[PDB]
From a paper:
The four MDR [name] variants exhibited resistance to all US FDA-approved [name] inhibitors, and the substrate recognition ability is also reduced in these proteases. MDR 769 adopts wide-open flap conformation in the absence of ligand. However, the peptide binding results in closing of the MDR 769 protease flaps as is the case for the wild-type protease complex.
The peptides CA/p2 P1’F and p2/NC were successfully crystallized with MDR 769 in P212121 space group. The CA/p2 P1’F-MDR 769 and p2/NC-MDR 769 co-crystals diffracted to 2.10 Å and 2.30 Å, respectively. All five [name] variants had higher probability of forming complexes with the CA/p2 P1’F peptide. Especially, the NL4-3 and MDR 769 were completely occupied by CA/p2 P1’F, and the fluorescent signal maintained as the base line of background signal. The corresponding relative resistance values were 1.7, 6.2, 13, and 21 fold, respectively. The higher unfavorable desolvation energies of CA/p2-MDR complexes explain the resistance to the uncleavable CA/p2 reduced peptide.
Numbering used by the authors:
A (entry chain D): 1 to 7
B (entry chain B), C (entry chain A): 1 to 99
Write the structure that this text describes.
Protein backbone atom coordinates (compact mmCIF):
# COMPACT_ATOMS: atom_id res chain seq x y z
CA UNK A 1 0.00 0.00 0.00
CA UNK A 2 1.03 3.62 -0.40
CA UNK A 3 -0.28 5.64 2.54
CA UNK A 4 0.54 9.11 1.36
CA UNK A 5 -1.89 11.38 3.20
CA UNK A 6 -2.34 15.14 2.97
CA UNK A 7 -4.97 17.48 4.38
CA UNK B 1 15.19 3.55 19.29
CA UNK B 2 16.48 3.05 15.72
CA UNK B 3 13.92 1.44 13.45
CA UNK B 4 14.78 -0.22 10.14
CA UNK B 5 12.24 -0.45 7.33
CA UNK B 6 12.44 -4.08 6.23
CA UNK B 7 8.95 -4.38 7.73
CA UNK B 8 6.19 -1.84 8.39
CA UNK B 9 7.38 0.39 11.28
CA UNK B 10 4.44 -0.23 13.57
CA UNK B 11 4.53 0.93 17.18
CA UNK B 12 2.25 0.78 20.19
CA UNK B 13 0.00 3.75 20.86
CA UNK B 14 -2.29 4.53 23.78
CA UNK B 15 -5.42 6.59 23.25
CA UNK B 16 -8.57 7.06 25.32
CA UNK B 17 -7.06 4.41 27.62
CA UNK B 18 -6.83 1.75 24.89
CA UNK B 19 -3.77 0.05 23.46
CA UNK B 20 -3.75 0.25 19.68
CA UNK B 21 -0.99 -0.03 17.10
CA UNK B 22 -0.10 2.35 14.30
CA UNK B 23 2.37 2.80 11.47
CA UNK B 24 4.98 5.58 11.80
CA UNK B 25 4.21 7.27 8.48
CA UNK B 26 6.54 10.03 7.17
CA UNK B 27 4.32 10.29 4.07
CA UNK B 28 1.36 11.47 6.16
CA UNK B 29 0.93 15.10 7.30
CA UNK B 30 -1.65 13.88 9.80
CA UNK B 31 -2.43 11.08 12.24
CA UNK B 32 -5.37 8.87 11.16
CA UNK B 33 -6.99 6.06 13.17
CA UNK B 34 -9.92 3.87 12.11
CA UNK B 35 -11.78 3.89 15.41
CA UNK B 36 -11.31 5.58 18.81
CA UNK B 37 -13.28 5.78 22.07
CA UNK B 38 -13.09 9.60 22.27
CA UNK B 39 -16.56 10.63 23.38
CA UNK B 40 -16.85 14.28 22.43
CA UNK B 41 -17.16 16.83 19.65
CA UNK B 42 -15.30 16.54 16.35
CA UNK B 43 -15.10 18.70 13.21
CA UNK B 44 -15.68 17.23 9.74
CA UNK B 45 -12.57 17.46 7.59
CA UNK B 46 -11.21 15.89 4.44
CA UNK B 47 -7.86 14.29 3.68
CA UNK B 48 -6.45 12.98 0.39
CA UNK B 49 -4.41 9.86 -0.40
CA UNK B 50 -3.20 8.27 -3.63
CA UNK B 51 -6.72 7.26 -4.64
CA UNK B 52 -8.64 10.43 -3.88
CA UNK B 53 -10.27 12.24 -0.98
CA UNK B 54 -12.20 10.95 2.05
CA UNK B 55 -14.22 12.40 4.94
CA UNK B 56 -12.64 12.28 8.40
CA UNK B 57 -13.58 13.31 11.93
CA UNK B 58 -11.12 15.73 13.49
CA UNK B 59 -10.44 15.51 17.22
CA UNK B 60 -8.33 18.23 18.78
CA UNK B 61 -6.04 18.33 21.84
CA UNK B 62 -5.94 14.54 22.22
CA UNK B 63 -3.61 13.06 24.82
CA UNK B 64 -1.91 10.18 23.03
CA UNK B 65 1.04 8.00 23.96
CA UNK B 66 3.38 6.82 21.23
CA UNK B 67 5.90 4.15 22.08
CA UNK B 68 5.86 5.43 25.67
CA UNK B 69 6.12 9.10 24.78
CA UNK B 70 3.16 11.18 25.93
CA UNK B 71 2.02 13.86 23.49
CA UNK B 72 -0.98 16.10 22.76
CA UNK B 73 -2.20 16.71 19.26
CA UNK B 74 -4.79 16.37 16.56
CA UNK B 75 -6.08 12.88 15.81
CA UNK B 76 -8.13 12.13 12.71
CA UNK B 77 -10.61 9.27 12.50
CA UNK B 78 -11.20 8.06 8.95
CA UNK B 79 -11.22 5.17 6.51
CA UNK B 80 -7.48 4.41 6.53
CA UNK B 81 -6.37 0.84 5.69
CA UNK B 82 -4.15 0.84 8.81
CA UNK B 83 -3.69 3.26 11.72
CA UNK B 84 -0.97 5.81 10.80
CA UNK B 85 0.98 8.27 12.93
CA UNK B 86 1.72 11.39 10.90
CA UNK B 87 4.40 14.10 11.05
CA UNK B 88 2.16 16.12 13.38
CA UNK B 89 2.86 13.65 16.19
CA UNK B 90 6.22 12.26 15.10
CA UNK B 91 7.77 15.76 15.33
CA UNK B 92 6.65 15.92 18.95
CA UNK B 93 8.51 12.75 19.94
CA UNK B 94 11.60 14.03 18.13
CA UNK B 95 11.42 11.40 15.39
CA UNK B 96 13.79 11.83 12.45
CA UNK B 97 14.67 10.01 9.25
CA UNK B 98 18.37 9.11 9.06
CA UNK B 99 20.73 7.72 6.46
CA UNK C 1 21.51 13.12 6.52
CA UNK C 2 19.26 13.60 9.51
CA UNK C 3 15.79 14.72 8.45
CA UNK C 4 13.31 16.24 10.89
CA UNK C 5 9.63 16.05 10.05
CA UNK C 6 8.42 19.65 10.39
CA UNK C 7 7.92 19.63 6.62
CA UNK C 8 7.52 16.78 4.07
CA UNK C 9 10.72 14.68 3.70
CA UNK C 10 11.30 15.40 0.03
CA UNK C 11 14.62 14.37 -1.53
CA UNK C 12 16.24 14.54 -4.95
CA UNK C 13 16.22 11.38 -7.01
CA UNK C 14 17.72 10.37 -10.33
CA UNK C 15 16.04 7.83 -12.57
CA UNK C 16 16.14 7.24 -16.31
CA UNK C 17 18.78 10.00 -16.29
CA UNK C 18 16.46 12.73 -14.99
CA UNK C 19 16.56 14.68 -11.74
CA UNK C 20 13.26 14.46 -9.83
CA UNK C 21 12.02 15.06 -6.27
CA UNK C 22 10.16 12.48 -4.22
CA UNK C 23 8.65 11.99 -0.79
CA UNK C 24 10.37 9.66 1.69
CA UNK C 25 7.32 7.59 2.65
CA UNK C 26 7.71 5.08 5.49
CA UNK C 27 4.00 4.32 5.10
CA UNK C 28 4.51 3.09 1.53
CA UNK C 29 5.51 -0.54 0.91
CA UNK C 30 6.39 0.43 -2.67
CA UNK C 31 7.89 3.29 -4.69
CA UNK C 32 5.58 5.17 -7.09
CA UNK C 33 6.37 7.97 -9.56
CA UNK C 34 4.04 9.89 -11.88
CA UNK C 35 6.26 9.72 -14.98
CA UNK C 36 9.58 8.24 -16.02
CA UNK C 37 11.54 7.16 -19.05
CA UNK C 38 12.45 3.52 -18.43
CA UNK C 39 13.45 0.82 -20.92
CA UNK C 40 12.27 -2.77 -21.02
CA UNK C 41 9.13 -4.55 -19.93
CA UNK C 42 6.62 -3.60 -17.27
CA UNK C 43 3.77 -5.56 -15.73
CA UNK C 44 0.41 -4.15 -14.62
CA UNK C 45 -0.21 -3.73 -10.87
CA UNK C 46 -2.82 -2.23 -8.50
CA UNK C 47 -1.82 -0.30 -5.42
CA UNK C 48 -4.02 0.77 -2.53
CA UNK C 49 -3.97 3.81 -0.26
CA UNK C 50 -6.30 6.30 1.39
CA UNK C 51 -9.11 7.02 -1.05
CA UNK C 52 -8.90 3.95 -3.26
CA UNK C 53 -6.60 2.10 -5.65
CA UNK C 54 -4.23 3.25 -8.41
CA UNK C 55 -3.32 1.38 -11.60
CA UNK C 56 0.44 1.41 -12.22
CA UNK C 57 3.21 -0.04 -14.42
CA UNK C 58 5.73 -2.11 -12.50
CA UNK C 59 9.39 -1.94 -13.51
CA UNK C 60 11.87 -4.28 -11.81
CA UNK C 61 15.57 -3.87 -11.01
CA UNK C 62 15.59 -0.20 -12.02
CA UNK C 63 18.70 1.81 -11.12
CA UNK C 64 17.75 4.85 -8.98
CA UNK C 65 19.81 7.40 -7.08
CA UNK C 66 18.35 8.80 -3.86
CA UNK C 67 20.33 11.77 -2.53
CA UNK C 68 23.29 10.52 -4.58
CA UNK C 69 23.07 6.96 -3.25
CA UNK C 70 22.77 4.40 -6.00
CA UNK C 71 20.15 1.73 -5.46
CA UNK C 72 18.46 -0.89 -7.65
CA UNK C 73 14.85 -1.85 -7.18
CA UNK C 74 11.25 -1.99 -8.29
CA UNK C 75 9.66 1.23 -9.48
CA UNK C 76 5.91 1.74 -10.06
CA UNK C 77 4.68 4.39 -12.49
CA UNK C 78 1.13 5.77 -12.68
CA UNK C 79 -1.12 8.75 -11.90
CA UNK C 80 -0.07 9.32 -8.30
CA UNK C 81 -0.63 12.81 -6.85
CA UNK C 82 3.02 12.86 -5.69
CA UNK C 83 6.31 11.04 -6.28
CA UNK C 84 6.79 8.63 -3.38
CA UNK C 85 9.84 6.65 -2.28
CA UNK C 86 8.73 3.53 -0.39
CA UNK C 87 10.41 1.13 2.05
CA UNK C 88 11.56 -1.09 -0.81
CA UNK C 89 14.23 1.50 -1.63
CA UNK C 90 14.70 3.19 1.75
CA UNK C 91 16.06 -0.06 3.16
CA UNK C 92 18.64 -0.10 0.34
CA UNK C 93 20.15 3.19 1.56
CA UNK C 94 19.95 2.26 5.24
CA UNK C 95 17.24 4.74 6.11
CA UNK C 96 15.92 4.41 9.65
CA UNK C 97 13.48 6.15 11.99
CA UNK C 98 15.17 7.48 15.11
CA UNK C 99 13.82 8.76 18.42
Amino acid sequence: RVLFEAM
Amino acid sequence: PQITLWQRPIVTIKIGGQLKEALLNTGADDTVLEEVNLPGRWKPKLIGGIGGFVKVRQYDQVPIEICGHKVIGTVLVGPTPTNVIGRNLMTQIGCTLNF
